[PDB]
Amino acid sequence: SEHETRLVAKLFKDYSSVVRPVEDHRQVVEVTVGLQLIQLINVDEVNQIVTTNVRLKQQWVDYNLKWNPDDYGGVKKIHIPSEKIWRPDLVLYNNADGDFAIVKFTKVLLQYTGHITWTPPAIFKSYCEIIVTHFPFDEQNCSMKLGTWTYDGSVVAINPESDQPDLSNFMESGEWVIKESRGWKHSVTYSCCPDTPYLDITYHFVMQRLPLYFIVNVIIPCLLFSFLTGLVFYLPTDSGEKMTLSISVLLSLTVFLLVIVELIPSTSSAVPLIGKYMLFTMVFVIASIIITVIVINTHHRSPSTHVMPNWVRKVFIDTIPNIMFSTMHPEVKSAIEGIKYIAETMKSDQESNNAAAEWKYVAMVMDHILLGVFMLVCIIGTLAVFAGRLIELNQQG
Amino acid sequence: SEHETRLVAKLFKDYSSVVRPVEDHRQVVEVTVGLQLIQLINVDEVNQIVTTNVRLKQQWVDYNLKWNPDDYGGVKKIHIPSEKIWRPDLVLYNNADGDFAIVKFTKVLLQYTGHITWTPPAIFKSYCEIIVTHFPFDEQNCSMKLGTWTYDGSVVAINPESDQPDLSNFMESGEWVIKESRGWKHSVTYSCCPDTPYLDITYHFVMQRLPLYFIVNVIIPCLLFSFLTGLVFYLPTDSGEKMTLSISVLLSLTVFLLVIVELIPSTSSAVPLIGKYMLFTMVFVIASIIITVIVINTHHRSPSTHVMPNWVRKVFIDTIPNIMFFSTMKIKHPEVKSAIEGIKYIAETMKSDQESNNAAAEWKYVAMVMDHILLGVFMLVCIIGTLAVFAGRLIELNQQ
Amino acid sequence: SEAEGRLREKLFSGYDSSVRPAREVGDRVRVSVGLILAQLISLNEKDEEMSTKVYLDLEWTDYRLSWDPAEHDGIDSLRITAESVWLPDVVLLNNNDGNFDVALDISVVVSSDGSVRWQPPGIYRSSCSIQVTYFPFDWQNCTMVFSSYSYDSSEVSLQTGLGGHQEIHIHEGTFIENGQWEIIHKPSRLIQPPGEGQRQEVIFYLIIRRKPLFYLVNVIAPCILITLLAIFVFYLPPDAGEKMGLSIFALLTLTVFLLLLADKVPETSLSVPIIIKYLMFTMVLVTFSVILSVVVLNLHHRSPHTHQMPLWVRQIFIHKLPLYLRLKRPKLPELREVVSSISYIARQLQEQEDHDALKEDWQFVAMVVDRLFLWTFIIFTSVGTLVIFLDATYHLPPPDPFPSR
Amino acid sequence: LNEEERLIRHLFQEKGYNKELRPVAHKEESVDVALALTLSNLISLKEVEETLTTNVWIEHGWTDNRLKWNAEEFGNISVLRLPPDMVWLPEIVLENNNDGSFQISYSCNVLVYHYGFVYWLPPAIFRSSCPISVTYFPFDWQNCSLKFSSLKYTAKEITLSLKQDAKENRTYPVEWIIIDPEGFTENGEWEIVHRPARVNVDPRAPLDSPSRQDITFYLIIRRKPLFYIINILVPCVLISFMVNLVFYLPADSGEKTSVAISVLLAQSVFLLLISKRLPATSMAIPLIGKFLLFGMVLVTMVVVICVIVLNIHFRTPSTHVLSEGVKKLFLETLPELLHMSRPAQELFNELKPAVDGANFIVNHMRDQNNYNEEKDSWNRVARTVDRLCLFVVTPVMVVGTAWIFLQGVYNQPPPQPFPGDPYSYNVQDKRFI
Amino acid sequence: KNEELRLYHHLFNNYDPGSRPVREPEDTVTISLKVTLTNLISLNEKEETLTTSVWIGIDWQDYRLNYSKDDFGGIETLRVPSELVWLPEIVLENNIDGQFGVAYDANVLVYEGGSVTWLPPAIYRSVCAVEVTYFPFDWQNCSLIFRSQTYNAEEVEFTFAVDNDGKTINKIDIDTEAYTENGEWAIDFCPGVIRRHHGGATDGPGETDVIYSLIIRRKPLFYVINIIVPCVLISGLVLLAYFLPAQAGGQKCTVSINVLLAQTVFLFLIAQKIPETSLSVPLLGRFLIFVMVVATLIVMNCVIVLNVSQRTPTTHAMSPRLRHVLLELLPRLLAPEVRCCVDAVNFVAESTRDQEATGEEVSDWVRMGNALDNICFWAALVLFSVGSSLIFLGAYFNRVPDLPYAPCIQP
């Protein structure tokens, strides 16, 4: 402490943090950079931003911060404020709504050889193109491009500490699993600086979403309502409640469209899987409503005003039922005429009832075929939209 | 500019930023204050806070910051960090959730005569009491009271640069039109500091809301449902859909009333006329539902349960239809003996059923007449109620 | 005091607050770490973060800041701005918002023997992994990990604050008690480094049990009521024409209450909350009520001539099942032209009687199936609700902060 | 300002003023710091966050004998404005903030008088913890506090006291929050009923603890319920009471259960709204929440009753037997008790087929008449049950609603700020020393 | 030993960053400006705020900071903290969040010859008033205004940077190595203009600034898929109420009012996406209000048709004029015991005849209702189709004008 006080006084007597810390200006400052991911705070899909808690370990040698421990009581390593010394100016290129550079200036560990290890913390808010093509079963390849802003590769060289980010202290996420993580070094020529390539290290993270929450809270209700859609065709017309069921299902699916459209970004690069399913099921419900209205209109066909066409009697009464229950004194004379009139009226009523029953039978055969077709279409559409991705995810091991 | 370097070294050799900048301490520092409104960022009605972007121009002479330009190579003005000099400590009295004083310490322009112009920017989040009476056709009056905090009028005097705020650089608002703006100087004695008045300059903005958004998104659906509530009285009872229509309308209006509740501050200084419209029309729909239930009950009455009161017949079948359009139509074998007795039984049963059907038809006619009278009552009541609530404020705006 | 000024001038001549106090190389500064909880501000499930207001209690020794009181007018202690002395770089490692430091640096109290006591206030947002399985009848285990950010265990040693209480200190009189969380256990532990750059930690644990009254009032009871109505759908006669409306509006109201829950539940995917499981169970039950009501309406309205009742349906749903369900079914040209008309009318009425008998038979089958479904729904609802409720109620907080597993 | 430039140079450079040392002759002495609070605006009370936002001016007054001068020696200067970072400060903070903002917002100049008095009146936007009592919402009153203390100094180094005013040469303490009429804006939702100020010394704490002393300014505030009344309570109450119309709807209408369940849906939406306006605490159920739960339970009962009435209405001889006891009870006894409206060889063989036919016709019509009459009797039984359920359900709902809302209508803050203490802490009652 | 330290001491030992780099007070400092857009982050319609990520490259001459490589070991570039050199203090004047300056204070690069370059990064949140008329087929004109916060035009002036060929880059620069395309907003144009004003004698010293104008086009595929198509389909469902029976169990009024409710929900859906301004109504809003009015009229139509269809003789009399108009004109435009038993049988027959005549009047009423339903269906379909077609054809002709500038992004 007395020894270290004397050492610290000596080291910064004539020190400069402006110049690069090399004996000769023609040399390159060799910086080792290693990213440690502590926590994946958030993946905002709507705003396409990833929030992470990181430690940006930076190692380099300062030529002018060496000493002999024998002259200072054997002190071999010290901790000093980072603001006093030259540091590399690492910037996150793809910063979205956070800070470009480190702002938390923690201490550096300085060895007697001049080696410096500075491990600042950071909250990175980085851009990420969110591909929603398979949401909620989607995989996101995000990145963190880090580089010295003002120093080109000929004066400061950054090298990755490791091929991969350090996940040894990573906190497990309840929403995402990091499948793969890599760190690649790149040299890039920018139009601003034609002849001086600048270096960067890009850390890539491939992450798979855990889909349980969205399955339970979104998909299952939609499946329930879309299954209820097909049941209008088994519900009798005389119930007077076909429209109630179908229209209430439609309104519920609209209210769920609200949630689903707030859950995704408004980009046009691709239509999401959940969006495709919602549009398909809305069109499914609307077709069911239209066909149900047609069926109801067929069921209530007045035999007096409407006459059964021959093609209807051939298609729905003769052919389809085979494919798929049963087919198809003045006073005394005036009183006698009255009894005869009553009998004739009963005859006319019976014939009218039979014609109405024929119309109702046609409507019901339509209902049976439609129940079968709509249950098959619902099941097969759901599978055609989901199984393609689910099989792939099950295959991915 | 070496001349400017030498000048700045000379000016601050023995300068004090704590001491007021006039030659003798008995003199008053004269400050000219002007406010430039660049943008009305937001008016939060619920929290009653107005967010504005402003430039707070402040001009004053510093006695100790003068020089002869001929001694400094013709330098007649310089730019100095504002933190280096004495400044007036202007504070926004009615700050709500912002800063009381300027925090952006931009440079000051200093002339050789000692004149200083300092034009810092600020985002003021000031308190404004929101008068909800005429919302969404309301006019607000939101003030910014600015004054030196620690200096009383006997040591520092502030004067308005202009009678009005400077709106030359004002960005257009998509929600508000500034009808009027005016700056007033005041001398106020506060209980904390008797016998030393403190000065302020209050800039007030009278701003009228642009009501098109709330007309499109709130008022029009409300009017559509408040027009639909009365079609229940033209619906037949046998349709079996009167309750469906009326209850759906009531539910829609109730949902919209709660949207309006979320749109306004929860104060009790006044009741909005839009809220009064919603409560009155919902009470009217509930009265319509009650009377509809009564009408349906009356329509289903039969001799098997009730008997027509004479007063009901007199009122609804004789008097009311007179003021109507008159579109309504106001031989010993036991088998043989059993057969004849049975034929007689059938005939008498049909006669009794006809009489019962006629009584039920009378009840149904009474229900229909009540349904017609209530339809006309709805037309006039709803039309004049909507007019009584809105036409007042609309005519008031038109007269202006 | 002029004596205090002279003592302060003496103490800080040649003093470097950036240098750790160590009379010899290899000496370790022993730092006692305690925590006082002033308020448990919140536990945000969505962000998975515990917000607390606390006072740290940091104690160490700085040999450079020692003096003889007799030589300085009897002054035995000093209050010095914390920026003027070396501080241990103690930070909340597991903060969730990027803020590592204390809210206000305030002053240290230095005794004449070099003992430094520092009690800074701190408003902290710490990461807490929310166990969602039993929400809102859940208990949480929210740690606050304190450690030196820079110095290793060979330079600065840590110990739990105790003089021995290994617990977060809560003052009974002045503690702002949360209206949603009860504190069950509040221990503190020293964690040795894993096994040089190695470091110790001092972790303060807060075991907290939620008070679930709100969720019982705003979610559970309405769900029970809607479930009870979904049961009573099966007692509604088919001829009323209201089964679909009742069941469907029950499902829609359950959706409204799911929207209510959507603002409150956690968003992780490691498990499903028990209240969400109950909501999904209820939604499935009402959906099956809709399905079965459609089936009953189909049976009731079955036209008698277009359908012939299978004999097995007759035996099952008219003879055997009603006994089990306690359903008891109750029980001369003029003359020739007149005779023919009378006989035709009688024949038509006999046909109508047969048609009505078949209609009534189908309707009785519908009634029996409805009663069977009513009893089945009562049993399934009661059993599932009882199972879920007993699972929720028997979930209790730990009796020991560190259970043996 | 030659003179006060000279005075500042004399006070701070010549005399060697040290702002880190307290203004005391001896270390054992304590500095008396008088404190007052002036409320300029009660900005808000956020119930969900349980936070009070206020705009205040904190008056600090103390003595620093190192900053005395003879005004005649210095051009008759009697007062100086100085930056607060030049002088020693008591370092008073808001202890019970809930956002980490302990200090005043704007560090304005101190005013130093020639007799050594330092006067500091900074403004502040303070965000403090106010636990909310929800029991009587929207007819609730709240009890917020603003506790001020020093963390840099204890009761051994500074002594907190309340500001003292004078009336007719008689000194009294200012035991309340100051409301300056020139600087106060009334809150549209919250009326200040009591505003006491108190010095609290913990007798059990040690003198060298920062928790030994504090000064607390309390605000007992009554909510103005007119907004909530008109906009929430009257709609919800009217819609809830509207459910009783189903008992007057005929069973043949086919819309009773629709009306009842629609009322239940409306109550659920109201519950959804009001749950978002209050914190999810477990200490009590809000009064509005109590009424809503009561109404939803009653409406669920009404829906079940409607189901039962519909079941009774549609019974026929083919499925049910109408017992004579039920007939007597529900068609004679209850209707008069409830005061319901009430009704009231060759030729032979040749024509034998027609006689047998006519007898069969007659038996068919007679059986149909009896069947229809039993159906009508079931309808009348359903009507009687509906009338009885009306007379039972409507008074219960009315009485329960009246009880629940009369709990809140007659809820008032106490006559005194502190129970057990007769003092009012009002400027009208000055407790002269 | 380091030549960088010698050069730094030689340049900065007697240097004043507070004074402009001019030999005379009347001279002007020329600043060459370039703005590189790396990511159009977002346009927040509700806040009317454009968020962008940019590099603000400024170049100028500081004669005090001139050196030769030959005198300093061949050094041609020196990185220096920006706080140690004079800067022109360029700010974004039209920021909305109070953030005037750049995000990271990067080093300046001092080249031999007195050239000073500064290329800091920045996240800017600028004011952009949103024209809502043609949303979601809209295009926006979001300006970025840059000026010196401190100096007037006579003290500091702006010029655009030049490319290799000596051509002025009077636009937002795009580097392909550091550009990210926004998924919702294409950048059609980005001209830059240097404006000078306030040069009048009464005005005093002149002022200048640089304004870039991002003309950006929304990519509307998302809103078409998720909002417009469902809204159009559920709005077209309102016409189905005309084909339902006008009986007790027809549910005409059920289907119509519930379609109106769905339209209201869609109004709420588009409320949470559009700006909150009142200068114009968005096209989607106009379409929704139109179809809501149409659905209200159709609800009234269903009520009228139900009223007409269910009329019966016991409470109504056959209006002959309406019958002629609807059923004729419209289609063309398109012993004691013996005597008592005889009396009884006659009563049966007469009652049967009366029932038949009543049933013939009811059938006529139903037929009139059907004819009204058909004609009203065709009228409503024509109105709905015409209005929707006009409203969306308003969007069809909305396009970025053919401006005389080069495209922002090279293909």
Could you tell me the domains of chain B? 2-210 (2.70.170.10), 213-399 (1.20.58.390)
φ, ψ of residue A338 in degrees (nearest 5): -65, -45
Q: Are residues E229 and E215 in the same domain?
A: no
Contact A16 E106 (CB under 8 A): no
Q: Give the neighbours of chain A: at least 3 Cβ pairs within 8 Å.
A: C, E
> Omega of the bond prior to B303 within 30 degrees of 0, cis?
no
Q: Are residues E211 and E267 in the same domain?
A: no
Q: Which residues contact C31 (CB under 8 A, 6 or more apart)?
A: C58, C59, C60, C88, C90, C148, C156, C157, C158, C159
Range of the domain at E165: 3-219
Cα–Cα distance, A22 to A64 (Å, whole number) = 8
Torsion on CA atoms C302, C306, C311, C317, rounded to nearest 10: 0
Q: Which of residues 197-236 of E touch B (CB under 8 A)?
A: none
Torsion on CA atoms A57, A61, A64, A69, rounded to nearest 10: 90
Q: Give the domain ranges of chain D.
A: 2-224, 227-409
Of all residues in chain B, the one with the smallest CA distance to E295 is B224
Task: Closest CB to E258: pick one of A239, A247, A268.
Answer: A247
Contact E347 B347 (CB under 8 A): yes
Would you say B321 and B370 are in contact if contact means Cβ atoms under 8 Å apart?
no
Task: Closest CB to B100: pick one of D2, D75, D105.
Answer: D105
- CA torsion sign for B318, B320, B323, B324 is negative
* DSSP string over E206-225: -EEEEEEEEEEEE-THHHII
Contact A325 C149 (CB under 8 A): no
Q: Considering only CB atoms, which chain B residues are within 8 Å of E260?
A: 224, 228
Domain boundary among E178, E194, E219: E219
Instruction: Answer yes or no: is E186 within a domain.
Output: yes
Task: Closest CB to E292: pick one of B221, B238, B241.
Answer: B221
* DSSP string over A145-212: EEEESS--TTTEEEEESSSS-B-TTPPPPSSEEEEEEEEEEEEE--TTSTT-PEEEEEEEEEEEE--H
Q: Which of residues 239-278 of D touch C (CB under 8 A)?
A: 251, 254-258, 261-262, 264-265, 268-269, 271-272, 275-276
Q: How far is E28 from chain A (nearest CA, A)?
A: 25
Q: Are residues E350 and E297 in the same domain?
A: yes
HSE-up (13 A, CA, CB side) for residue B384: 6
Would you say E122 and E105 are in contact if contact means Cβ atoms under 8 Å apart?
no
**Interface contact D351, partner C, CB < 8 A:** yes
Q: Position A125: which residue type? A: K
Identify the CA nearest to E212 among candidates E296, E142, E261: E142
φ, ψ of residue A213 in degrees (nearest 5): -60, -50
Q: Residue B54 in 3-state DSSP?
A: strand
Cα–Cα distance, C232 to C227 (Å, whole number) = 9
Question: Which whole-number Å values give the CA distances from A6 to A66, A72, B169, E335, in the listed order?
Answer: 14, 8, 59, 148
Cα–Cα distance, D379 to D313 (Å, whole number) = 5
Q: Are residues E144 and E238 in the same domain?
A: no
HSE-up (13 A, CA, CB side) for residue C39: 22
Q: Which CATH number fits domain D2-224: 1.10.3720.10, 3.40.50.720, 2.70.170.10, 3.60.150.10?
A: 2.70.170.10
Q: How far is A24 from chain C (nearest CA, A)?
A: 30
Residue D172: which region, alpha, beta or left (left: phi > 0; alpha: psi -120 to 50)? beta
Q: Which two tokens stand for residue E78?
A: 């020196």
Q: How far is C174 from chain A (nearest CA, A)?
A: 34
Question: Which whole-number Å values give the CA distances from E376 to B331, E305, E355, E370, E382, in the listed order?
Answer: 64, 10, 32, 10, 10
**Residue for token pair 């029970």:** C224
Residue C48: which region, alpha, beta or left (left: phi > 0; alpha: psi -120 to 50)? left
Q: How far is D164 from chain B (nearest CA, A)?
A: 12
**Residue for token pair 């950010």:** C149
CATH architecture of the domain with range C2-211 = Distorted Sandwich (2.70)
Beta-strand relationship, E77-80 and E29-44? unpaired
Resolution (A): 2.1
Q: Which residues contact A103 (CB under 8 A, 6 or more apart)?
A: A122
Q: Are residues E264 and E188 in the same domain?
A: no
Identify the CA nearest to B54 among candidates B28, B81, B24, B90: B90
**Interface contact D259, partner B, CB < 8 A:** yes
Q: Residue C104 in 3-state DSSP?
A: coil
Task: Closest CB to E347: pick one of B79, B239, B350.
Answer: B350
Q: Considering only CB atoms, which chain A residues are within 8 Å of E123?
A: 95-97, 100
Residue D414: which region, alpha, beta or left (left: phi > 0; alpha: psi -120 to 50)? beta
**Interface contact E65, partner A, CB < 8 A:** no
Would you say E361 and E313 are in contact if contact means Cβ atoms under 8 Å apart?
yes
Task: Closest CB to E245: pick one of A188, A258, A296.
Answer: A296
What secondary structure, in 3-state letters, does B188-216 show?
ECCCCCCCCCEEEEEEEEEEEECCHHHHH
Contact D280 C106 (CB under 8 A): no
Cα–Cα distance, E302 to E239 (Å, whole number) = 11
Task: Closest CB to A343: pick one of C24, C127, C341.
Answer: C341
Of all residues in chain A, the one with the smallest CA distance to E36 is A192
Cα–Cα distance, A254 to C255 (Å, whole number) = 12
Q: Which two tokens stand for residue D80?
A: 């100086």
Q: Considering only CB atoms, which chain E residues are within 8 Å of B3?
A: 25
Would you say A262 and E272 are in contact if contact means Cβ atoms under 8 Å apart?
yes
Q: Which two tokens stand for residue A295?
A: 């069926």
Q: Are residues E172 and E280 in the same domain?
A: no
- CA torsion sign for D169, D175, D181, D182 is positive
Chain D interface, best mutation among C97, C105, C119, C123, by max D CB count within 10 A: C123
Cα–Cα distance, C133 to C268 (Å, whole number) = 11
* DSSP string over C122-181: EEEEEE-----TTTTS-EEEEEEEEEESS--TTTEEEEE------B-B--TTT-B--SSE
Contact E245 A271 (CB under 8 A): no
Q: Residue E243 in 3-state DSSP?
A: helix
Instruction: Answer yes or no: is E408 within a domain.
Output: no
**Interface contact D100, partner C, CB < 8 A:** yes
Q: Residue A278 in 3-state DSSP?
A: helix
- CA torsion sign for B66, B67, B73, B76 is positive
Domain boundary among E173, E204, E219: E219
Contact D261 C250 (CB under 8 A): yes
Q: Are residues E72 and E104 in the same domain?
A: yes
Q: What is the CATH number of the domain that holds E13?
A: 2.70.170.10
Q: Considering only CB atoms, which chain C residues are within 8 Å of A321?
A: none
Instruction: Answer yes or no: is E411 within a domain.
Output: no
**Interface contact C329, partner D, CB < 8 A:** yes
Q: Considering only CB atoms, which chain B residues are within 8 Å of D108?
A: 89, 91, 101, 149-150
Q: How far is B30 from chain D (nearest CA, A)?
A: 14
Q: Which two tokens stand for residue B175?
A: 């929600």
Segment (H or E) for E29: strand E29-44
Cα–Cα distance, A116 to A80 (Å, whole number) = 10
Helices H / strands E in chain A, number of each = 8, 11
- Report helix angle C333-393 to D346-409, nearest 10: 30
Q: Considering only CB atoms, which chain D residues are within 8 Å of C173?
A: 202
Task: Closest CB to E344: pick one of B8, B75, B347.
Answer: B347
Would you say D74 and D4 are in contact if contact means Cβ atoms under 8 Å apart?
yes
Instruction: Please list the residues that pair with B30 across neighbouring strands.
Output: B157
Cα–Cα distance, C82 to C110 (Å, whole number) = 10
**Interface contact D49, partner B, CB < 8 A:** no
What secondary structure, in 3-state letters, does chain D show?
CHHHHHHHHHHHHHCCCCCCCCCCCCCCCCEEEEEEEEEEEEEEEECCCCEEEEEEEEEEEEECHHHCCCHHHHCCCCEEEECHHHCCCCCEEECCECCCCCCCCCCCCEEEECCCEEEECCEEEEEEECCCCCCCCCCCEEEEEEEEEECCCCCCCEEEEECEEEECCEEEECCECECCCCCCECCCCEEEEECEEEEEECCCCCCCCHHHEEEEEEEEEEECCHHHHHHHHHHHHHHHHHHHHHHHCCHHHCCHHHHHHHHHHHHHHHHHHHHCCCCCCCCCCCHHHHHHHHHHHHHHHHHHHHHHHHHHHCCCCCCCCCCHHHHHHHHHHHHHHCCCCCCCCHHHHHHHHHHHHHHHHHHHHHHHHHHHHHHHHHHHHHHHHHHHHHHHHHHHHHHHHHHHHHHHHCCCCCCCCCCCCCCCCCCCCCCCC
Contact C235 D311 (CB under 8 A): yes
Q: Considering only CB atoms, which chain C residues are within 8 Å of A214?
A: 269
Q: Considering only CB atoms, which chain E residues are within 8 Å of B221?
A: 264, 267, 292
Q: Give the domain ranges of chain C.
A: 2-211, 214-393
Cα–Cα distance, E160 to B79 (Å, whole number) = 26
Instruction: Answer yes or no: is E157 within a domain.
Output: yes
Identify the CA nearest to E208 among candidates E144, E149, E147, E150: E147
Q: Are residues E322 and E287 in the same domain?
A: yes
Instruction: Please list the residues that pair with E78 across neighbouring strands.
Output: E110
Q: Considering only CB atoms, which chain E residues are within 8 Å of B220?
A: 289, 292
Q: Considering only CB atoms, which chain D residues are within 8 Å of B194?
A: none
Segment (H or E) for A79: strand A77-80
Cβ-in-10-Å burial (0-12, 13-18, 19+) of B75 comes to: buried
Contact E281 B340 (CB under 8 A): no
Domain boundary among E197, E219, E241: E219
Instruction: Answer yes or no: is E145 within a domain.
Output: yes
Segment (H or E) for C295: helix C274-300
Q: Which residues contact B376 (CB under 8 A, 6 or more apart)?
A: none
Q: Which residues does a chain break follow in chain D (C to N more than 2.5 Å)?
A: 344
Cα–Cα distance, C102 to C95 (Å, whole number) = 12
Q: Considering only CB atoms, which chain B residues are within 8 Å of D165?
A: none
DSSP letter at C235 equals: G
Task: Closest CB to D152: pick one of C8, C107, C345.
Answer: C107
Q: Give the neighbours of chain C: at least 3 Cβ pairs within 8 Å.
A: A, D
The alpha carbon of residue E354 and the mean position of all alpha carbons in its chain are separated, in whole angstroms, by 67
φ, ψ of residue A247 in degrees (nearest 5): -70, -40
Cα–Cα distance, D331 to D379 (Å, whole number) = 10
Cα–Cα distance, C98 to C103 (Å, whole number) = 13
Q: Which two tokens stand for residue A123?
A: 């909250």
Q: Considering only CB atoms, which chain D residues are within 8 Å of B101?
A: 106, 108
Q: How far is B302 from chain D (nearest CA, A)?
A: 9
Beta-strand relationship, D164-167 and D170-173? antiparallel
Contact C127 A107 (CB under 8 A): no
Residue A88: which region, alpha, beta or left (left: phi > 0; alpha: psi -120 to 50)? beta
**Interface contact D411, partner B, CB < 8 A:** no
Identify the CA nearest to A215 among candidates A228, A224, A205: A224
State the Cα angle at C348 between C346 and C350, rounded to 5°.
70
Q: Which two tokens stand for residue B383?
A: 């039309």
Cα–Cα distance, A89 to A107 (Å, whole number) = 16
